[PDB]
From a paper:
The γ-[name] has a helical shape consisting of 14 spokes, each containing a copy of γ-tubulin presented by the C-terminal gamma ring protein 2 (GRIP2) domain of one of five paralogous γ-tubulin complex proteins (GCPs). The GCP proteins interact via their N-terminal GRIP1 domains in a specific order: the γ-[name] core harbors four pairs of GCP2/GCP3 (spoke 1–8), followed by a sequence of vertebrate-specific paralogs GCP4/GCP5/GCP4/GCP6 (spoke 9-12) and finally another pair of GCP2/GCP3 (spoke 13-14). The inside of the γ-[name] is lined by a lumenal bridge composed of one [name] molecule, as well as two α-helical modules formed by the microprotein MZT1 ([name]) and the N-terminal extensions of GCP3 and GCP6 (N-GCP3 and N-GCP6), respectively.
We subjected the purified [name] γ-TuRCs to cryo-EM SPA and identified a subset of particles with stoichiometric [name]/N-GCP3/MZT1 grapnel density. Local resolution ranged from 3.9 Å in the core of the complex to 5-8 Å for the [name] segment, where the resolution was initially limited by the plasticity of the [name] segment with respect to the γ-[name] core. Next, we performed molecular dynamics flexible fitting (MDFF)31 of the AlphaFold2 model into the consensus cryo-EM density, resulting only in minor changes. Overall, this indicates that the [name] tetramer interacts with the remaining four available N-GCP3/MZT1 modules. The [name] grapnel interacts with the asymmetric side of the γ-[name] through docking of the two proximal N-GCP3/MZT1 modules (p1, p2) to GCP5- and GCP6-specific extensions just N-terminal to the GRIP1 domains at spokes 10-12, respectively. Consistent with AlphaFold2 predictions of the interface, a helix-turn-loop structure specific to GCP5 inserts the conserved GCP5 residue Leu252 into a hydrophobic pocket formed by the N-GCP3/MZT1 module p2, which is supported by basic residues interacting with aromatic and acidic residues on GCP5. Moreover, the conformation of the γ-[name] was not affected by the presence or absence of [name], suggesting that [name] binding does not activate the γ-[name] for MT nucleation.
Numbering used by the authors:
A (entry chain m), D (entry chain l): 2 to 437
B (entry chain L): 1400 to 1632, 1648 to 1695
C (entry chain M): 605 to 661, 671 to 764, 821 to 867
The structure:
């Protein structure tokens, strides 16, 4: 009874979760309409947390896929994952709604589809014996995932008050603003809701995805459909200490609690090294334990856009370093001995810090039971560089006199412009103030 | 050969970095926790140059001795008070005796002090890197005759050790392995290995542990502290420091001449190279 | 040996075995093994109860509460989780090689109880004074877990019990350093000290 | 922890390091990305020190290659060593700027590529344990390699005031003036940086290269195009105390420290004996080490233009004799015993001089692991004969009229020509003053 309903919502957010669900069948090694293997209980030692708790003798996904675009739910059946999803909770065969592109359009459409959105996730969290929480797999990009998603962070936060809240935030591309210009308004609107009706975030910059897609994959030009590959991997990578053995704080409310020093200091930088084609053929011949988990303490894999002078003028407070598959686990403390001799990572000395290392035995699948994958879940205090990026683009646009009565056409009829500047400046001083 | 004679010289190189955490003593922590955190980083110092892994560097262990280097307050050192201790264990101790361990601590300790001279002389070469932490390449406010007395210093040390390195390595490695092995019937090795060890320290320097050659290596060390402390930071005090060095080298020349007998220690032949140098000007 | 003792928590099992596996694992050996269970049974209840006070929670008491729970959970996690994690994975490995190797059923029992007294000593030194320091660490999350279910001046009672166990681990640090200086358990508890260092 | 960044710069500087890296794979006898022999770990007991160890099945050079013509580094692309170098980490594949041939082009192009030029050698070090220094493998020939490389002789000894500077300067052919006609200008400007913005230097004359190529390697056809073949051999010879262990002077700053008496004297004459072909028809019966150091105390290998009555009117002050590999190491001290009886050594007519002998092993590689090898890294006071050659070809150009205005087309617009002349006669004279 550690059941999570993931709320894949938004146009880009459904796609990062689509290929997330196609990965879990591949590592439990089952045909997606049954358990057809015995590796289902021996290899993966959990049978529920992203599955419905049995009463039929089957394991159905605990998934909701809500969008206002039917293009995402019609792309279910262009693949054989339309006999894994069932049409009454996980989708609704044809569902319309607004274009919508404006945040304040979808935010009031949350308030009249209030009956179905709070009775669609409770007609599937009515087999659970105590809910772990809701992970809002929703995009910050577009006005569909962002409009409805800033609403649900308020209402699952007043009827489920001890529930774990956690988002997979994915931003809109910031280096194209020749096709969009509403981009600093709709982004910062969600971020205000993230620093007081939410507890944890995961911040994923899109230009810092595409940094890696040209530095590890080597495509001619990154575009939506080549961006679902880096995001979907880090999702199935975060539940490799919740589905596979650990021992202590291997529940989801153990790891995620220890990466939050305090509300408004929870912005987690993510790194994921294995996408390259000549580092994928170095694990067949085994690479050393003394270099595959010190490379998760080397900053060159970050999915947050920052400077390289702020990774040395700022220090880690909570860092998680997940090695997968091969590990050789009797030199994992030898690897931890050597952090002090190279000094690649710097650590707080004003107060306690934690370098959490974990290893887990995964189920059979050649990309992960023979291949070393390293997932980083940092908490580094140069996240204020993103908050400068969104405030410096917000104030520049309101002086060109745009979105001051052209964003107020739906549900906004009050002043709230300096309310968004002041809360961002609160966050940027209270992080920096928490560590000397 | 690799960890006492330093033919894996990458270890003695890593030692130079550990010796860059020293610069004399005391000023370093004194705890019973001081060997506990220091025996680890020395075993790791072979990996610190990225060579091998611990499983042929666990034959070597270190026992840190405590001695007063504040000269009544205890503060320990890694010049002559850091000692390699070879293991006694069931596979090799047909070669291992406690007498032969006494001289493993002596060779490892004899190398380490002369190496701290050579290292700290190159701390001076980083000081004076030019554009413009050098200040001055010649007179006035002196560099010309300063550096003239500096170069005849680093002549003498680099060419003394050079002669000492060649009697240390070549006959000892031919004497040992080949001979012992070839003579086959192997029994009671530790009476032969110690005779080997007794020829090996004859080749090192020996000095009969009493003779003014031992007084000149003590005394040229006492000026070497005045050379690093003045250059890190007095020009009349510079030139006095090497006038005492010139006293000590001219004292050495008269000692070579009363050691000259007809053939008497392999250092003697190599010393008469330098004697005929002295004759040439 | 006295650490692990009957309180409100004294949880074990009694493993059902029969001949000829009953002399592979002596019940007297199971009493020797269930106290090493018990040492890890307390520190996961410590560690899980600092999660359960974190999820039960600016204003006056609220802002101070995030700093005492953040500092208290890293105290519990750097001594307990790390020392156990460098324990459990090598100990599985040194037992699979004593498992296969045996031509008798009193050989694998002797190779298990000469394993078992090493595991006690390096994880817990014999003296009642490590008891004293575990409970004070535990009493500050005990002042916490009721105060998140009760609804200032509550913080300074928590801070006085925070300073009580801080003085005592420093006294514990001196008890680490007056040990053998020769046997690898001092090397184990030094690595405890470096995890609390960063 | 003695990681050195080679800064290969210029038209020739890229070529002498192109054949340096190529020399290491062939002397360790392995693939430049594989292992096909066990001599790689057994011969070379510190496989990474100018490389880094495998994690992708490929060797990683610690090299940068910038130049003002993009043609020379595309002549590194053409060659099949693109699985020993990286054309996005190890070089900028097409880097332009000047025509060029002016010294003043590249000196002003390091100061508008000032931000990028120290984030490519400090991004080239990023897993390093600790830096030894920089070797500026740059060219004096042309104004391109000389132009930007002379700016880095200053900024690398005060942004890193404790790291090593030492240059492989290679001059353009002094039997031409039709290759580069700005040659007396670009030489002397760098020679001002060689005496006071340096530490130690290696100056290599080009006409003494072709003196040896027809007398020890006996090719009929003396040309300017044997410039890189004799150089790449002495480059790989100089670092057999860092890529294979030493004992005393077990660092490279060990050898180089004892060959510098004063600033302005440190110009080392390099000699390397194994070029003889009559020592190779007598390698079955093992050639002798008793007459191979009568080539380091008598001319037979100088790549420095020096006179024949300047090996007697000047003496050795410091002389280092590096024996390498198989050599019969038990009579090399017997060989140094018979030097003093003949008097082949030369010592100053006042105080101390020193004939240093040291030894070091090498990996399997028959011309210096089956034959006696002699490297001389000399320090002779006869180095003013070249400084008179460069000064006498410099003032000769000013009575021809050229580069008194054709140098001031970019950057230089103030007079400082008799300022480079005046400092040079100060150099040539204090050296003669320093001895009786």
């Amino acid at each position: 009874p550690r059941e999570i309903i993931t709320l894949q919502l938004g146009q880009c957010g459904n796609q990062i979760g689509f290929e997330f669900w196609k990965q879990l069948c591949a590592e439990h090694g089952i045909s997606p309409e049954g358990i057809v293997e015995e590796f289902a209980t021996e290899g993966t030692d959990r049978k529920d947390v992203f599955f419905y708790q049995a009463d039929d003798e089957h394991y159905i996904p605990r998934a909701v896929l809500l969008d206002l675009e039917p293009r995402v739910i019609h792309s279910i059946l262009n693949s054989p994952y339309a006999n894994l999803y069932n049409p009454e909770n996980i989708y609704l065969s044809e569902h319309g709604g607004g274009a919508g592109n404006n945040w304040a359009s979808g935010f009031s459409q949350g308030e009249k589809i209030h009956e179905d959105i709070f009775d669609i996730i409770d007609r599937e969290a009515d087999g659970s014996d105590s809910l772990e929480g809701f992970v809002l797999c929703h995009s910050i990009a577009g006005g569909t995932g962002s409009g409805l998603g800033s609403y649900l962070l308020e209402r699952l936060n007043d009827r489920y008050p001890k529930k774990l809240v956690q988002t997979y935030s994915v931003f809109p591309n910031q280096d194209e603003m020749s096709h969009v210009v509403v981009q600093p308004y709709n982004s910062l609107l969600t971020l205000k809701r993230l620093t007081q009706n939410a507890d944890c975030v995961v911040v994923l910059d899109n230009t810092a995805l595409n940094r890696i897609a040209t530095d590890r994959l080597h495509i001619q030009n990154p575009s939506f459909s080549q961006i679902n590959q880096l995001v979907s991997t880090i999702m199935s990578a975060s539940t490799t200490t919740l589905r596979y053995p650990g021992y202590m704080n291997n529940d989801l409310i153990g790891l995620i609690a220890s990466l939050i020093p305090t509300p408004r200091l929870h912005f987690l930088m993510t790194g994921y090294t294995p996408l390259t084609t000549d580092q994928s053929v170095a694990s067949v011949r085994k690479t050393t334990v003394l270099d595959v988990m010190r490379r998760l303490l080397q900053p060159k894999n970050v999915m947050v856009s920052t400077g390289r002078d702020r990774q040395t003028n700022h220090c880690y407070i909570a860092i998680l370093n997940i090695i997968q598959g091969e590990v050789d686990p009797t030199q994992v403390h030898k690897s931890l001995q050597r952090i002090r001799e190279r000094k690649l990572a710097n650590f707080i000395p004003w107060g306690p810090a934690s370098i959490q290392v974990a290893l887990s035995r995964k189920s059979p699948y050649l990309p992960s039971a023979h291949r070393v994958s390293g997932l980083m879940m940092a908490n580094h205090t140069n996240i204020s560089s993103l908050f400068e990026r969104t405030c410096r683009q917000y104030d520049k646009l309101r002086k060109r006199e745009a979105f001051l009565e052209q964003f107020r056409k739906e549900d906004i009829f009050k002043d709230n412009f300096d309310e968004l500047d002041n809360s961002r400046e609160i966050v940027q001083q209270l992080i920096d103030e928490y560590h000397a | 050969r690799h960890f006492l004679l330093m033919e894996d010289g990458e270890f003695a190189q890593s030692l130079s970095d550990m010796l860059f955490e020293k610069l004399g003593s005391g000023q370093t922590p004194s705890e019973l926790l001081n060997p506990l955190v220091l025996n680890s980083i020395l075993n790791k110092a072979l990996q610190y140059s990225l060579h091998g892994d611990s499983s042929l560097a666990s034959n070597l262990t270190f026992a840190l001795k405590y001695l007063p280097e504040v000269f009544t307050p205890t503060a320990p050192d890694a010049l002559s008070c850091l000692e390699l201790k070879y293991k006694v264990d069931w596979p090799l101790n047909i070669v291992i005796t406690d007498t032969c361990m006494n001289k493993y601590s002596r060779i490892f300790s004899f190398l380490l002090q002369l190496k701290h001279m050579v290292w700290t002389l190159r701390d001076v070469w980083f000081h004076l890197k030019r554009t413009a932490l050098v200040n001055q390449a010649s007179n006035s406010v002196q560099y010309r005759q300063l550096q003239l007395y500096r170069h005849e210093m680093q002549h003498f040390v680099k060419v003394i050790q050079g002669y000492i390195a060649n009697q240390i390595l070549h006959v000892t490695w031919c004497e040992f392995r080949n001979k012992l092995s070839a003579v086959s019937n192997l029994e009671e090795i530790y009476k032969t290995h110690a005779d080997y060890l007794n020829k090996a320290l004859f080749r090192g320097l020996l000095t009969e542990k009493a003779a003014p050659l031992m007084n000149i290596i003590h005394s040229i060390f006492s000026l070497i502290l005045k050379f690093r402390l003045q250059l890190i930071s007095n020009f009349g005090l510079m030139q006095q420091s090497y006038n005492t060095f010139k006293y000590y080298s001219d004292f050495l020349f008269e000692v070579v001449s009363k050691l000259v007998n007809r053939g008497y220690q392999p250092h003697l032949e190599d010393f008469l190279l330098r004697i005929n140098f002295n004759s040439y000007y | 040996t006295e650490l692990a003792l009957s309180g409100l928590e004294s949880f074990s099992f009694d493993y059902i075995v029969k001949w000829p596996l009953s002399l592979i694992i002596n019940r007297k050996a199971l009493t020797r093994y269930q106290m090493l269970f018990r040492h890890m049974f307390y520190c996961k209840h410590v560690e899980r109860l600092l999660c359960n006070v974190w999820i039960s929670n600016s204003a006056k008491w609220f802002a101070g509460a995030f700093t005492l729970r953040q500092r208290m959970l890293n105290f519990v996690q750097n001594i307990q989780y790390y020392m156990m994690f460098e324990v459990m994975e090598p100990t599985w490995h040194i037992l699979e090689k004593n498992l296969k190797s045996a031509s008798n059923i009193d050989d694998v029992l002797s190779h298990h109880t000469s394993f078992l007294d090493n595991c006690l000593k390096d994880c817990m030194l014999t003296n009642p004074e490590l008891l004293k320091i575990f409970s004070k660490l535990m009493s500050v999350c005990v002042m916490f877990t009721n105060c998140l279910q009760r609804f200032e001046s509550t913080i300074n009672n928590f801070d006085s019990n925070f300073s009580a166990h801080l003085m005592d681990l420093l006294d514990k640090l001196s008890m680490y350093s007056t040990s053998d200086c020769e046997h690898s358990m001092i090397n184990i508890i030094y690595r405890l000290d470096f995890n609390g260092f960063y």
